Amino acid sequence: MATLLTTDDLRRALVESAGETDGTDLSGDFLDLRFEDIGYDSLALMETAARLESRYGVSIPDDVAGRVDTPRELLDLINGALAEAA
Template structure:
């Protein structure tokens, strides 16, 4: 099974939102809402689409609106990856 980590998620969020790689997300961010981290629904939509394409995983359409924190999105990704294993 492919491991998808918080580090991987942050890298993809940055790429899909067009951020500089130098921007640091310090501290514990697993339970910080995406909007407080500076990511809107468009950034999440682009990130989810990229994850689906790159990892060949199918995520529910609602994941963009229902996953409000990195922890929630990582759980959805883990479930999707487990389903394809």
């Protein structure tokens, strides 16, 4: 819906949950850059998604929140959630 996250928005969330960072290699489309490769553990990732959950009034299944290997999956998952929630 209007509520949607693009790669740029998704980047922002990981920047926010990482704290004071430059955003490393999340520049542009990092959808193919795996979380393990950007030093992002599923726990941190859940917190990232958590910010998004709270912000967009959604809830992401705890299995799926740490089931995503690549940002593309996570982006799509939230896109599908935000398809219904706004």
